[PDB]
Amino acid sequence: XXXXXXXXXXXXXXXXXXXXXXXXXXXXXXXXXXXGQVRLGMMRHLYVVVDGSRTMEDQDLKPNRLTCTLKLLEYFVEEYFDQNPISQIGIIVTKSKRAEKLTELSGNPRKHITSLKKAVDMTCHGEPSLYNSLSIAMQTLKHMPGHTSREVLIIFSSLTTCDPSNIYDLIKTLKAAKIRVSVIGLSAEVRVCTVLARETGGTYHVILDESHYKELLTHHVSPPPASSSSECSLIRMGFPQHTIXXXXXXXXXXXXXXXXXXXXXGGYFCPQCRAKYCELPVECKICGLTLVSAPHLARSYHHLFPLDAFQEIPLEEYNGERFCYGCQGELKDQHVYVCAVCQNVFCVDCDVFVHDSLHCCPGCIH
Amino acid sequence: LNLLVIVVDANPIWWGKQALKESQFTLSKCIDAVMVLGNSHLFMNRSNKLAVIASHIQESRFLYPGSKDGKYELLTSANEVIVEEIKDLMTKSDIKGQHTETLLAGSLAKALCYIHRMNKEVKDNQEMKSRILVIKAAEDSALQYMNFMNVIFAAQKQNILIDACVLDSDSGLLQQACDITGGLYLKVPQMPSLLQYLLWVFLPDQDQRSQLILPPPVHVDYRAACFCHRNLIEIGYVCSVCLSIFCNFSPICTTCETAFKIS
Amino acid sequence: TSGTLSPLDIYPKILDFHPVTMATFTMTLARVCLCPMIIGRGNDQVAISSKFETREDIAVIRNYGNLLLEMSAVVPDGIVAFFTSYQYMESTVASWYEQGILENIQRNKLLFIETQDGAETSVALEKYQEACENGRGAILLSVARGKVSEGIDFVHHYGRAVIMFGVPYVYTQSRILKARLEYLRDQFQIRENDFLTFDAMRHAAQCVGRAIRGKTDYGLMVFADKRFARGDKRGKLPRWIQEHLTDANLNLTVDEGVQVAKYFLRQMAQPFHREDQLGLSLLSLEQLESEETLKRIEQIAQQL
Amino acid sequence: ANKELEEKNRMLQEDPVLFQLYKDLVVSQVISAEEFWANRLXXXXXXXXXXXXXXXXXXXXXXXXXXXXXXXXXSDIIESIFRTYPAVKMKYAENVPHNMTEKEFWTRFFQSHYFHRXXXXXXXXXXXXXXXXXXXXXXXXXXXXXXXXXXXXXXXXXXXXXXXXXXXXXXXXXXXXXXXXENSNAAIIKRFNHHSAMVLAAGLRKQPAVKRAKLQESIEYEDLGXXXXXXXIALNLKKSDRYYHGPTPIXXXXXXTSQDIINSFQSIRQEMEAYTPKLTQVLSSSAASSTITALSPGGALMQXXXXXXXXXXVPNDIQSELKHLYVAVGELLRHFWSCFXXXXXXXXXXXXXXXXXXXXXXXXXXXXXXXXXXXXXXXXXLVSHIEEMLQTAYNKLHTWXXXXXXXX
């Protein structure tokens, strides 16, 4: 009731500035990113199980937990389809001791984000059911092929995990069915989700803030490394070229579509069944082939020959290269970042840009 | 507020063969058409910005960054620094043999992070749209494809358009980039008219692409080959560890030495 | 040797006893590992106590049930709730039914009430341990005197929040108490109000301090009535619990205690891996041979 | 049992497009109804793949009222009581007409042991309460604590237990002093113990080993032993140059002899010395006029492209025809290419392939009949894409036949 005494003063002219700068510096933090030269699960049928519990309506977040969770899942679907194109998502809301396959396992963000914009309007009545949700996710994820790192992400809030049967035989089955389940938890640590996470192979985490929860979902965007158990197969792939209406439709093949459609003149075929698809990449609806344009293999090549660390040094320190090798600007701050191989000079803006978006050192290309 | 970033493929070997060809069109009219496009872009509006990069064979040195002869003054200073920078670049030069094909990935990387820092410079009232012209005249090396796609996807995320005027030869990676980012591709059919191509197709900004009727998009080939025999594929075998394209089915995956599980 | 013995000044003063070493070892931690709170303030600002001597006061039992409800809604995986006497647990769980509370506690977690059968207690314990592992929430409420809290120990996730209801005073027993107290006045020199407080605190801190097994275990351990803040009764809890009893935590409300529990569990459910202990709360082979570590271990242990 | 019939029907009803398909295939004399409904397994597991277990307050979720003696119609409550109290299950087996109704029966259900938590001689639930007491005494006497291996054995957690003779606290369990309200409070304790035990057992369907197991579990510390990190299989790529120049085919890249390097360096070092003509050298106006001639819509670089001449003549009903056709041929090629891919070298899968061959040939006959009945209206709208798909099915069938006859 006396927080007003948190503001001290020594000279009081820049001392209130020092207290405000200490507070504003203590109101921020940096992320923790991990590097690996290890095998990753790059075809990735992930399957999101959201709570629809009573505890979703609690107001620990700035809106209630349903709204914030659903907003960050909209961001999650966006960044996951932005970074892994082959993969798919399916969304289950778990509600009233039963599980509901809200959006089936598909690979385009339009249907999922449309369903989340719908699912803002829900009710969140009852206690969850981890049994039935893992059962529906298992039931769909039995028969995906063995090289797929089949992954479930349970955004789980409440504590009473109201199952209708025994949920250690599910964990033994899902251990044998080489699935991988990771739970992001709200407000607590629950022993059953801990056993599920450490036994199926996943990772369990509990949420402080908006920013920490964004860091956790960003941690689950990237393809997680594989165990010594998952099959390393060789999936047969198809690379259909784009085909416009051939020569002003001189002996074309006028089709409707293949999944309220208009008359398609041309587009993408299939090299297996010779059907008609508008969008690529799409799993072949009548063959079982997977269809790839092949920058969609190049969109996720940075995981395989990855980045390295920047040697971060704040001080002045021998810098005979005053200008940024990134964008030709002066280093007006005390943070200078130097690469490993070429050992050029980069600033903070070039650091965040290279390590988040461009994914390569501009020096090592030269 | 707009930001044109011209990139001129200054291959000294290619323009050297062009200047020993004794044609009409040499490097002088290329860099002069570059500067007239730059002064035209600064001339169209006060708030416009300009940056001109020159990919050499071994370095991405930027070119950019009173009135004696009647120009506007900042156009005169920009032309003086571009002229003196290409004279410092091309004359004082080197010779090596293992790396003689030009590069385009690094200059595009510098352009991407330059547009990033110049978008951090922008205040809250105004907003910056941006594009990268690429004036290519040489043959691109295949060896940096792993790098090259990456900068395209950066321009996919950073919403930077990419345009390309190729001079002599077609380039699959660069028409690929201009297909992905939403930019524009153009293969010039006659050299010395270069400036008049630029001042109608590549001078107009994003809110004039939609107004002008422009030359139509060429169909883009999504050819794909194996890493085995380099030949064209319509159905391939792709690993899930190495993520590499194989043409014919093989037991032991060569790209990552995978102990392949056989069924 | 015990995990709780406090104060150590009184075991030579009862047992005709003169030892070499009277030692207390301070809980050195790299992570808070426990928080005791003294919830001695109702949500209506009613003074929580047990002054009535087992003859029920209604609003205090109401605030006990409100504490158990909201602490059920916060804490995971099993809450242990020690009452004063089996007549008092009998009466409390009686008036948690006619008053509309106990169905809500059912909605959050699964109760397992105690009885003084030798076999029914074991079945209730077995179902309580099969409900802390099969998903749901389980809450064992017992008496702080009997065999439930003497041997049967509650480890990493069986009791997260040991709720000590009341101050356990031996109130039912006869003139054996008055006569042992007259003896300790006369032929030993230990006061009336000193020995009663000592006995009550050894039972309360005996039943509380079972929840924690190692450094990687965390136990909320609440004390629910105002008397645990009164200096002599707080002064006879052991040193490794008074060290983590903050003056802000001293005499919390119900809801302030619930928010401290939430912040406790959220700050203490994160990856606290072995690499966070090799500095402070763990020692390797070669971290022993340094004489700076020897100075540290000289500073930790104390005597009385 | 006529299950399948009722399923395929229920679907056809709910799914009229599928009904259409079912007609266009079965009724069209291409395949038989049994095959179609046979290999079309796509449905849910159960009503919810399980039910809703009795969480708690199965008597106090919408307590005694589907709006005491109010209405009783909530499905979760009646199913949770059916699971939870099997004495009420057997009572529902007995007294269900046979002379009472759910109004009177559930009015006699909100009596004691079940809603009030009492213990007394009462109405028709009295013998059910006696059987529940016998189940509790069977759990206490005929059964015991299963994990009494190294803990939780409350009867024998004392090595020397005696009678009330030579002790201090011998007035622990008193054979006297049995009151009314006190026995009621003990009854409330017993009913909640039994209620939570039935919840936990209903959600759980049907030696030195266990003792050393519980001992070694309760002794150990997670700190003072081994770590918790699984593995990470190291992916050290062998030939990363295959990644560097990717799936782009090898362009014609023949830079000539390194004499040209020296010649070009000489010529361009001489070239970029003398520089900056701006008025004179840049554009001749005739080149600009020819460029405007080219970029005008009848010249070079204006490819006569973005034409896209379409055939929108009879849109809507032909679109409906093509919706029926692409649904039908999608189901046909679904079955064909789903069974086709791996040869599955036995006689059952080859027989399914022969049935697929028969369905394929009759599908081609039905497609030719549909093309004749459709495209003979106004002479437009090439349907030959569906004929391309069915011709590729025809081709894979004959190519598999020649391949397996080579593999004979």
Ligand SMILES: [Zn+2]
């Ligand atoms: Zn296909």
Ligand SMILES: [Zn+2]
């Ligand atoms: Zn580098």
Ligand SMILES: [Zn+2]
């Ligand atoms: Zn920079």
Ligand SMILES: [Zn+2]
């Ligand atoms: Zn591989």
